[PDB]
Enzyme design. Structure first.
Site, PDB file in Angstrom:
ATOM      1  N   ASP A 257       0.829  -1.194   0.000  1.00  0.00           N
ATOM      2  CA  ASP A 257       0.000   0.000   0.000  1.00  0.00           C
ATOM      3  C   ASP A 257       0.868   1.250   0.000  1.00  0.00           C
ATOM      4  O   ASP A 257       1.892   1.315   0.688  1.00  0.00           O
ATOM      5  CB  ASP A 257      -0.938   0.005   1.211  1.00  0.00           C
ATOM      6  CG  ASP A 257      -0.254   0.468   2.486  1.00  0.00           C
ATOM      7  OD1 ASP A 257      -0.704   1.476   3.076  1.00  0.00           O
ATOM      8  OD2 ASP A 257       0.754  -0.153   2.883  1.00  0.00           O
TER       9      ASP A 257
ATOM     10  N   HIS B  49       4.700   4.311  -3.121  1.00  0.00           N
ATOM     11  CA  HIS B  49       5.438   5.535  -3.407  1.00  0.00           C
ATOM     12  C   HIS B  49       5.829   6.268  -2.131  1.00  0.00           C
ATOM     13  O   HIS B  49       6.888   6.904  -2.082  1.00  0.00           O
ATOM     14  CB  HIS B  49       4.605   6.453  -4.303  1.00  0.00           C
ATOM     15  CG  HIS B  49       3.164   6.534  -3.907  1.00  0.00           C
ATOM     16  ND1 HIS B  49       2.225   5.608  -4.310  1.00  0.00           N
ATOM     17  CD2 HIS B  49       2.500   7.432  -3.140  1.00  0.00           C
ATOM     18  CE1 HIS B  49       1.047   5.931  -3.809  1.00  0.00           C
ATOM     19  NE2 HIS B  49       1.186   7.034  -3.096  1.00  0.00           N
TER      20      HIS B  49
ATOM     21  N   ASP C 252     -10.842   0.738  -2.291  1.00  0.00           N
ATOM     22  CA  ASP C 252     -10.892   2.130  -1.855  1.00  0.00           C
ATOM     23  C   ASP C 252     -11.676   3.064  -2.775  1.00  0.00           C
ATOM     24  O   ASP C 252     -11.816   4.245  -2.441  1.00  0.00           O
ATOM     25  CB  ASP C 252      -9.475   2.692  -1.676  1.00  0.00           C
ATOM     26  CG  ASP C 252      -8.768   2.131  -0.454  1.00  0.00           C
ATOM     27  OD1 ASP C 252      -7.905   1.245  -0.620  1.00  0.00           O
ATOM     28  OD2 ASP C 252      -9.079   2.576   0.672  1.00  0.00           O
TER      29      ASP C 252
END
Length: 1525
Positions: free
Chosen positions: A533, A536, A668
């Site tokens: 998750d 980045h 999500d």
């Protein structure tokens, strides 16, 4: 048995890209291991690195890679291993990298600098994908169907989970994504994890309980499992947070957050008293927000000592000054500005009188002044006594110092509060975010920016919780010193989880790194991969270490990441170094139908009919290369990676984009019910499933849950209602992809075409090998937007078949439950009414839709392109080597080259080059003409190119390739090559029009390579084992040597004749030129090995000897022109080159030639019976040139007059040449002659230059005598071996002189008459007239000519004598002289034909200028300034020889102590041929120009390919080869 790829490297060690697939990563193909073979049994893949010969990296070059050298050896990211680079100037080096385990590998190079330093290239990463099998059935990475499931919604028991497993296994997914299965934290969100080292105790007890459950998925449902892995945070209630508080960011570890802590506790401790005064604890009045903000302004902002963190306590500094004042003082230095400059003086103090950490936030008063040094500054500037004004002065300084800190203060606090109101509005006013709810243990006025607890050490800490900045760089750690986001309140926080503080390594948090490692490797023992998750936001080196650890546990770890960095390059960088296997893409992110079609286009595949990659003219073709003589050495059980064709040039490792896992909806993003409608759940998923990538879906998407589930709050359970909504459709889609998964492997195997029309979206999916396809018509329902009818679908040369059709219909709203999550009732109606018309003539399938096709419906057709079958692929790539078998280095000219003028010669003007509309013609009629255009077209997939368009609209270019060979069907091997081309082209024409370009280019490329290979096999070793550049040079020998119909080298036959250059020096009298033939003979014919062609050219000119000279204008041995004082000595030079090189070449001397002219020098009698009158051996032919030259030669050119030169004057046809026996050298010519290679005769009537030679080179020409010495040296050592019977030579009077006497005459007098000493003192010995000079340290261009200042001109001509007779030169003089040519006469590609400091220097050549300029009009500049390329050959050959004899830094003790050049000298030679490689690379004619204007400027009159231009660079390579290799 053949799993190797070719990673070519540049001269800087960068990997070469073979195609432009876009921003990508060097990923190796996704393939299963060979039959019944396990990891370790053999290398999974072998990366063959190709290093360019003699490139800068080959100098002391090493290859360094973190690829373990054996399966036994483990992988260390930072442990690198050496591979030595085998240096050669001719041959490239190859260095295999055997790979035994998937993962991330990288390599850099180390080499010796040009400062003799150690330099290092970049690390370049390449990835080996995991190998996902489920039992013993391999799963291709692009056939993955992933179902994401949240654990707390699947019921409380393992058995209550296997009901969901069987539910998804029916929909035929092959992988399940598990939201973290770990002990969950306080707020029960799956991502705030209590303990990383045990699973949910509500369901699991041990690893074996979950590892066996996950294994049960593998055996009961053929399903693989992967789990989320959270790196950025842990839950705010881990019992180890008490035992180890340093793993986060606290006031101890991250001091800059202290100012942010006292602001967060100033709000939890202010919400509780907020009720007391002016509360409006909750209300929807903006006007009241101010009364809550005005309470902020005072109670929190004013009471907190914020400025004190930025500002310096002035009053505390001054009282700390008076007290200290009687101490260290006197800043004995004038580094002081006045009190006038109150801005600069202030800053000066800011630099010198400050404790460490100024301007940076820390403790409450972390910005303070060093008092001893602030006092000392004041004393010197003002007064030693404090009372004498210091108090006012010191305070005024510090005030001015704080002005930027105060401005910085105001700037910050405005953002702090302005962000609080806009947030708290949304958060509480419910403007679009419902939750007015007021103060509690929850819903306070500010979300908790910190997690407060009492640690087992006793002290109270305040760790921070992480989150995300709004539009901030996710690579920037907002919890680190370099960010103010926690202070500025610019953080959107998750009170669920607490940010973890990884440092620069484990040294900064040895527990966190040690814990996460055991956390990672635990799940790596269980699952098949991870899902990371916010990857980045995870730091790079952090993610790199742990993924390496997991890969050590589970080498086939499948890594997935929803990766959204700042760019594609950054996305690729993360995928490169982390070893991510798939990036997550969401389909619900699309806002409109057009946005979706774009998304689907990105991940859909390559365009239909796209070009395929073949090695063209940018590759070396080693004669000793392995070949599939019929493309038949691949066993399907070897799972090998196939070469492009029969020539086994391995598959090229090129950057491709990282693989994608396309999610039609994630856990999500909002449900189709919310963002669009529920009807779209059908077309959306179908469009996604048609993409060329892995697909996925969240559970509930197919079951059409009404709204996205709250990961935090909800506790309801997945319904047990089976076969709801899309469930039947995903079973069909995934089953369809399971069948497709078997054949399509590489990026060029799966093509596509997506069309958008209103609410309709078209997806055609095509395999480029078998022609199988699927056609999807999907009518999307983003909104209820009315009735729209789709136009008739037409598919050319394709047959279609109805596969299935469905409509999705809502049957009322969703049930309202409290203990179970149930979706919206749907009717999955099967559709009909599709009309599939097929025209048996045009072979055009038409597809009509029925009007009963509501929004939210799909239909799928199985399609098949006509003419494509699994055998077509093998047909096109086979038989090409056998076709080129009977070819010859002569006949290859007719297949690859042939300028249009050379083509007309055979076609009586009928044919020529193919005119490509909206473009023009290829420069050669042969395959090279196509390749020179196609290479850039294949690289960019330029399907819009005029040639691409033309190849779709007709089969004319297809037929042109085959038909033109009728002109040459009789020559050796062309008939067989033509049949192969014909057989394949005919089979291509039977394909749909849009597929012709790719197969046309593929077929041409394949036959091109086989012909290029055949050339390298027929040539000699030195050419067959060399770099591209050397081979590209050698191919010019085939461009220039062919048989013609209008001319030849023999009068009685038509045979192979070397052109001077293409296209203008190729036909009739304009083709053969004796000067050009023999200057090029060594390079194009001897270096390549075409000895039998070198002999025939020598013998053909032997017949034309007259005046003891060789003609330049060879009219096929039929009335040649004899104004060439140069050709006869280049002619005898080549004879020596022939005898030296050809094995047994001495046999040439006794070869008898029909002398088709008289022994004296009568007149043209081509028909007289005295033509074939008598015979002359090459023995007497050589002697006749030497003898008659001495004895003297006097004659006016036969048939003199305008009918030979319509501009040369009457006295210029009188040519005389004799020897000045006081020197022994050769003089000749006049101011009306052009006897040397510099033979431009002026002609401008307007400029008055008719008959005036631009460069008459009369008298002693350097080369002519240098070539004479070479000839003399030749015949002397020759007679020594009993192969030359002559020794006397008759003078004009009647004297005789031995050849050794003439030889030693030149040896003594040459350097005397020609050198120009650098010291004025020596002029008295070298016959020097210092009045006419320009540069010292030079060899004269001429000796006692007409214009004596033309004697002393710096011209490259002297280098010829240095090459052919180096005995005449003393090493230091030659060395220093050619170093000046390197600085003066050496251009980038051409040799400047005249010293730029001379007055006559005009380096621009226009043979069309009409103006009055005496120099430039009608192109007299030809030989004064312009930069010629063939002279560069003689130059660098001597530059080599004399830098090897002179400079000791250009020598090294070669093996067996024999003298061989050093890398310093090789590096120098290399740097002077780059601009030539660049030229032949980017030239439509695959050769070198004949001429260049000043400083490399293209001369529009220069021939684009010339013989001596390339043959003299080949000369250099043969030197280096024949002497040191």
């Amino acid at each position: 048995a053949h799993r190797t790829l070719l990673l070519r490297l540049s001269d800087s060690g960068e990997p070469v890209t073979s195609c432009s697939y876009g921003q990508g990563v060097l990923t190796l193909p996704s393939l299963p291991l060979p039959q019944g073979k396990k990891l370790g049994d053999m290398p999974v893949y072998t990366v063959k690195l190709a290093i360019p010969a003699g490139s800068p990296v080959t100098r002391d070059g090493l290859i360094w890679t973190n690829c373990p050298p054996d399966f036994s050896t483990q992988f260390d990211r930072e442990k690198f291993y050496k591979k030595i680079i085998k240096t050669s100037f001719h041959e490239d080096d190859h260095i295999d990298l055997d790979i035994y385990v998937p993962g991330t590998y990288c390599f850099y190079l180390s080499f010796k600098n040009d400062k003799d330093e150690l330099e290092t290239t970049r690390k370049f990463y390449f990835v080996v994908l995991p190998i996902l099998s489920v039992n013993d059935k391999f799963i291709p990475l692009n056939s993955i169907a992933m179902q994401s499931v949240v654990s707390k919604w699947m019921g409380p028991t393992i058995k209550d989970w296997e009901k969901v497993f069987a539910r998804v296994a029916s929909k035929k997914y092959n992988m399940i994504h598990f939201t973290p299965l770990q002990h969950r934290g306080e707020s029960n969100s799956p991502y705030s994890i209590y303990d990383q080292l045990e699973f949910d105790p509500t369901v699991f007890k041990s690893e074996k309980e979950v590892a066996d459950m996950v294994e049960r998925l593998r055996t009961e449902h053929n399903i693989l499992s992967l789990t989320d892995i959270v790196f950025n945070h842990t839950a705010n209630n881990s019992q180890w947070l008490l035992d180890h508080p340093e793993a986060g960011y606290n006031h101890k570890t991250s001091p800059h957050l202290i100012s942010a802590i006292e602001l967060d506790k100033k709000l939890l401790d202010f919400s509780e008293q907020m009720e007391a005064l002016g509360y409006p604890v909750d209300l929807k009045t903006v006007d009241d927000l101010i009364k809550v903000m005005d309470g902020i302004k005072e109670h929190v902002i004013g009471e907190l000592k914020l400025w004190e963190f930025y500002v310096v306590d002035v009053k505390q500094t001054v009282s700390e000054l008076r007290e200290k004042w009687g101490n260290s003082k006197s800043w004995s230095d004038d580094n002081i500005p006045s009190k006038d400059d109150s801005t600069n003086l202030a800053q000066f103090v800011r630099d010198n009188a400050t404790e460490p950490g100024f301007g940076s936030l820390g403790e409450r008063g972390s910005n303070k002044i060093n008092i001893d040094k602030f006092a000392a500054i004041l004393k010197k500037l003002h007064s030693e006594d404090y009372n004498n004004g210091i108090e006012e002065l010191a305070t005024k300084i510090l005030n001015d110092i704080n002005l930027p800190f105060y401005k910085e203060y105001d700037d910050d606090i405005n953002e702090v509060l302005e962000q609080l109101f806009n947030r708290i509005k949304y958060l509480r006013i419910d403007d679009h975010g419902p939750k007015q709810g007021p103060i509690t243990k929850k819903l306070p006025l500010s979300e908790p920016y910190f997690t407060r607890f009492k640690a087992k050490d006793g002290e109270e800490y305040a760790l921070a919780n992480n989150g995300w900045i709004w539009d901030g760089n996710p690579l920037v750690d907002f919890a680190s010193s370099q960010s103010k986001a926690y202070l500025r309140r610019e953080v959107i926080v998750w009170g669920d989880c607490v940010k973890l503080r990884y440092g620069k390594g484990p040294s900064d948090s040895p527990y966190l790194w040690e814990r996460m490692s055991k956390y990672v490797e635990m799940n790596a023992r269980i699952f098949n991969g991870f899902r990371i998750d916010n990857c980045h936001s995870t730091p790079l080196h952090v993610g790199q270490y742990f993924l390496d650890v997991a890969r050590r546990v589970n080498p086939n770890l499948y890594v997935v990441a929803e990766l959204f960095s700042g760019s594609e390059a950054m996305d690729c960088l993360f995928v490169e170094r982390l070893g991510i296997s798939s990036l997550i893409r969401e389909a619900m992110q699309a806002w409109s139908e057009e946005e979706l079609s774009r998304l689907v286009h990105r991940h859909g595949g390559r365009p239909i009919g796209s070009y395929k990659f073949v090695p063209l003219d940018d590759f070396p073709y080693p004669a000793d290369v392995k070949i599939d003589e019929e493309y038949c050495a691949y066993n399907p059980d070897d799972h090998s990676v196939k070469c492009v064709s029969e020539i086994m040039i391995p598959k090229t490792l090129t950057a491709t984009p990282p693989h994608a896992l396309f999610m039609d909806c994630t856990h999500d993003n909002e449900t189709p019910n919310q963002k669009r409608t529920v009807e779209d759940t059908l077309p959306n998923a179908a469009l996604v499933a048609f993409c060329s990538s892995a697909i996925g879906s969240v559970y509930g998407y197919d079951e059409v849950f009404p709204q996205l589930l709250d990961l935090v709050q909800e506790k309801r359970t997945y319904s047990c209602a089976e076969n709801t909504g899309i469930s039947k459709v995903k079973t069909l889609l995934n089953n369809m992809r399971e069948e497709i998964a078997s054949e399509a492997v590489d990026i060029e195997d799966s093509e596509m075409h997506v069309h958008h029309d209103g609410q309709y979206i078209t997806f055609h999916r095509t395999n480029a090998k078998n022609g199988k396809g699927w056609y999807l018509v999907a009518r999307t329902k983003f909104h209820s937007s009315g009735d729209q009818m789709l136009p008739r679908i037409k598919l050319s040369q394709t047959k279609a078949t109805f596969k299935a059709a469905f409509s999705l219909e809502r049957t009322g709203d969703a049930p309202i439950s409290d203990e179970i999550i149930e979706g919206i009732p749907t009717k999955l109606r099967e559709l009909t009414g599709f009309d599939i018309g097929f025209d048996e003539n045009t072979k055009e399938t038409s597809i009509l839709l029925p009007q009963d096709f509501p929004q939210g419906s799909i239909v799928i057709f199985e399609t098949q392109q006509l003419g494509i079958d699994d055998s077509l692929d093998h047909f096109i790539r086979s038989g090409a080597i056998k076709a080129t078998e009977k070819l010859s280095l002569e006949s290859i000219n007719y297949v690859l080259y042939r300028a249009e003028q050379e083509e007309y010669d055979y076609s009586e003007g009928r044919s020529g080059a193919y005119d490509i509309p909206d473009y023009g013609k290829p420069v050669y009629c042969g395959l090279q003409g196509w390749v020179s255009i196609l290479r850039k077209i294949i690289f960019y997939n330029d399907l819009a190119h005029p040639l691409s368009n033309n190849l779709r609209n007709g089969h004319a270019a297809v037929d042109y390739v085959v038909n033109r060979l009728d002109l040459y069907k009789d020559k050796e091997g062309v008939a067989e090559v033509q049949e192969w081309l014909r057989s394949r082209m005919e089979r291509i024409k039977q394909l749909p029009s849009y597929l012709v370009p790719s197969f046309f280019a593929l077929v041409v490329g394949i036959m091109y390579g086989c012909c290029r290979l055949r050339a390298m096999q027929l040539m000699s070793d030195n050419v067959g084992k060399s770099t591209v550049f050397v081979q590209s040079l050698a191919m010019t020998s085939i461009q220039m040597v062919s048989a013609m119909k209008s001319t030849s080298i023999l009068p009685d036959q038509n045979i192979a004749a070397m052109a001077a250059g293409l296209p203008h020096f190729s036909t009739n009298y304009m083709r053969c030129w004796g000067r050009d033939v023999f200057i090029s003979l060594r390079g194009l014919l001897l270096t390549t090995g075409r000895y039998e062609e070198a002999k025939e050219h020598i013998l053909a000119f032997a017949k034309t000897l007259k005046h003891g000279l060789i003609p330049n204008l060879l009219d096929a041995g039929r009335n040649p022109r004899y104004n060439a004082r140069d050709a006869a000595w280049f002619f005898v030079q080549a004879i020596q080159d022939y005898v030296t090189i050809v094995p047994g070449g001495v046999s040439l001397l006794q070869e008898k030639v029909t002398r088709r002219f008289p022994l004296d020098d009568e007149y043209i009698p081509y028909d007289d019976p005295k033509a074939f009158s008598y015979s002359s051996t090459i023995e007497e032919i050589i002697y006749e040139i030497l003898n008659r030259h001495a004895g003297g030669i006097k004659y006016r050119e036969a048939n003199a007059g305008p009918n030979l030169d319509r501009v040369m004057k009457d006295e210029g046809f009188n040519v005389e040449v004799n020897v000045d026996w006081e020197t022994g050298l050769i003089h000749g010519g006049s101011q009306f002659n052009c006897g040397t290679w510099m033979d431009k005769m002026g002609e401008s009537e307007k400029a008055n230059s008719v008959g005036v030679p631009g460069t008459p080179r009369d008298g002693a020409a350097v080369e002519i005598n240098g070539l004479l010495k070479s000839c003399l040296r030749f015949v002397l050592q020759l007679s020594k071996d009993g192969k030359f019977k002559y020794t006397e030579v008759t003078k004009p009077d009647g004297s005789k002189i031995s050849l050794s006497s003439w030889n030693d005459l030149l040896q003594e007098n040459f350097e005397r008459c020609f050198y120009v000493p650098k010291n004025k003192e020596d002029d008295n010995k070298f016959e020097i007239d210092a009045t006419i000079i320009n540069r010292r340290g030079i060899y004269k261009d001429l000796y006692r000519s007409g214009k004596p200042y033309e004697d002393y001109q710096f011209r490259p001509n002297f280098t010829i004598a240095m090459v052919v007779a180096p005995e005449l030169f003393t090493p230091d003089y030659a060395a220093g002289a050619i170093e000046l040519a390197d600085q003066v006469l050496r251009g980038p590609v051409g040799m400047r034909t005249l010293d730029p400091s001379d007055y006559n220097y005009r380096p621009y050549y226009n043979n069309g200028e009409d103006s009055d300029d005496f120099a430039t009009s009608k192109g007299r500049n030809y030989h004064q300034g312009p930069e010629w390329v063939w002279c560069y050959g003689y130059f660098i050959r001597a530059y080599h020889y004399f830098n090897f004899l002179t400079n000791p830094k250009c020598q090294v003790e070669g093996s067996a102590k024999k003298l061989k050049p050093s890398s310093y000298l090789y590096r120098k030679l290399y740097s002077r041929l780059l601009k030539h490689r660049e030229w032949i690379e980017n030239s439509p004619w695959a050769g070198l120009a004949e001429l260049t204007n000043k400083d490399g400027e293209v001369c529009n009159d220069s021939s684009p390919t010339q013989a001596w231009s390339t043959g003299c660079l080949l000369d250099l390579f043969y030197d280096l080869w024949i002497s040191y290799e």
